[PDB]
Structures are given as structure tokens and as C-alpha cells.
């Protein structure tokens, strides 16, 4: 990898629940990827062009606890398992890849950067197959090109007997397509 990553837990369980109910998060926000949670489950969200994008199957309809109360979904594209909120101030946004590379890097929930070989528009095979548990909880995590630019957000995996052989992701082009629907 030419890219590295590290994680920082900013909230605990009790404070999490609380903030979920009020919808008011005054904690300072940093970084390009946020670790995100509802009461039941947890997953990632990625920032691209000022919008925080995550998966619909983790956050469905829900708002995002923000510094001035809850934030409504700007974008909701059930068809592509994609939702988006306006990035809380402080969230450093990634920008889309323009180079067309096939040498991708998926950044996971535990801050692993793992090589992915670009296969289609929304598809890429893992160079070293991992266990599924190694990947679970990373939906809404970013796929990056070698220069650290965004090509897509992690949606799903293809696997057999608990070992992940390939990854599906929403292409960054579909995010701008969703943003092209006023």
C-alpha cells in the first residue's frame, strides 16, 4: 500500500445512545472516514465532495446527529444501497479519482488498507482472500486509487464458507448521478 490509516474511538456506548435520541452531536469531527453507529449495528461512512455517504442497509431512513441537531438525508438512492448527509463541519472530504487506475485499496473499520483489483464499474476482486468477519462492519468504507482519491464506497462482498473473494461497491460516478437528481 502507498496509503496508511489509523482509527480513534471518540464515543462510548452510553453517550452514543444518548446522542442518537437527541440528534445533537457537538463533538468535534475530523478525518475523511467516520465510524458510525445506530443502537444495534455499526459501520463506516465516507466523505466525498462535501457529502457523507454510507449504505442504506446500515442507516436506512435515519438522520445524522449534528452540531445543530439532526441532519436530514440529502440523498437517498435505495436502488444502489446509498444515502448521504451534508458533511458536519470538520469532516475532511475526499475527492473522486480521475486517473482510471485498477490498483484499488479498501479501507476497513479496523484501519486495514487492503488491495483490490478493479474488475467492472462496481466490482473488484481481493488479491489476498480474507475471512468475512475481517470485513463485516466496513460498509460505507472507501475504495481509494493509488493517489488516495475516492472511486467508490464498500457495499457488499462475494464469498464462500466465510471467506471473502471479491467486493461490490457503489461507484463514485453513481453518487454524482444521485446528486444530479434534484
Amino acid at each position: 500500500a502507498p496509503i496508511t490509516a489509523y482509527s480513534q474511538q471518540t464515543r462510548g456506548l452510553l453517550g452514543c445512545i444518548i446522542t442518537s435520541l437527541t440528534g445533537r452531536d457537538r463533538n468535534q469531527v475530523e478525518g475523511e472516514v467516520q465510524v458510525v453507529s445506530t443502537a444495534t449495528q455499526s459501520f463506516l461512512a465516507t466523505c466525498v465532495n462535501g457529502v457523507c455517504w454510507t449504505v442504506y442497509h446500515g442507516a436506512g431512513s435515519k438522520t445524522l446527529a449534528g452540531p445543530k441537531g439532526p441532519i436530514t438525508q440529502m440523498y437517498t438512492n435505495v436502488d444502489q444501497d446509498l444515502v448521504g448527509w451534508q458533511a458536519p463541519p470538520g469532516a475532511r472530504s475526499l475527492t473522486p479519482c480521475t486517473c482510471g487506475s485498477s490498483d484499488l485499496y479498501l479501507v476497513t473499520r479496523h484501519a486495514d488498507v487492503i488491495p483490490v483489483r478493479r474488475r467492472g464499474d462496481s466490482r473488484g476482486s481481493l488479491l489476498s482472500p480474507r475471512p468475512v468477519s475481517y470485513l463485516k462492519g466496513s460498509s460505507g468504507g472507501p475504495l481509494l486509487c493509488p493517489s488516495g482519491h475516492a472511486v467508490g464506497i464498500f457495499r457488499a462482498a462475494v464469498c464462500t464458507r466465510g471467506v471473502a473473494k471479491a467486493v461490490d461497491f457503489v461507484p463514485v460516478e453513481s453518487m454524482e448521478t444521485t446528486m444530479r437528481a434534484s
Partner: peptide, 13 residues
């Protein structure tokens, strides 16, 4: 009902 909450972050470089 409830909101999604930011319980952490991943920094890149």
C-alpha cells in the same frame, strides 16, 4: 426514530 451517531473516525495520509 433515532439518529445515526459518529462514534469514531479513520484518519488517512
Amino acid at each position: 426514530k433515532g439518529s445515526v451517531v459518529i462514534v469514531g473516525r479513520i484518519i488517512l495520509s
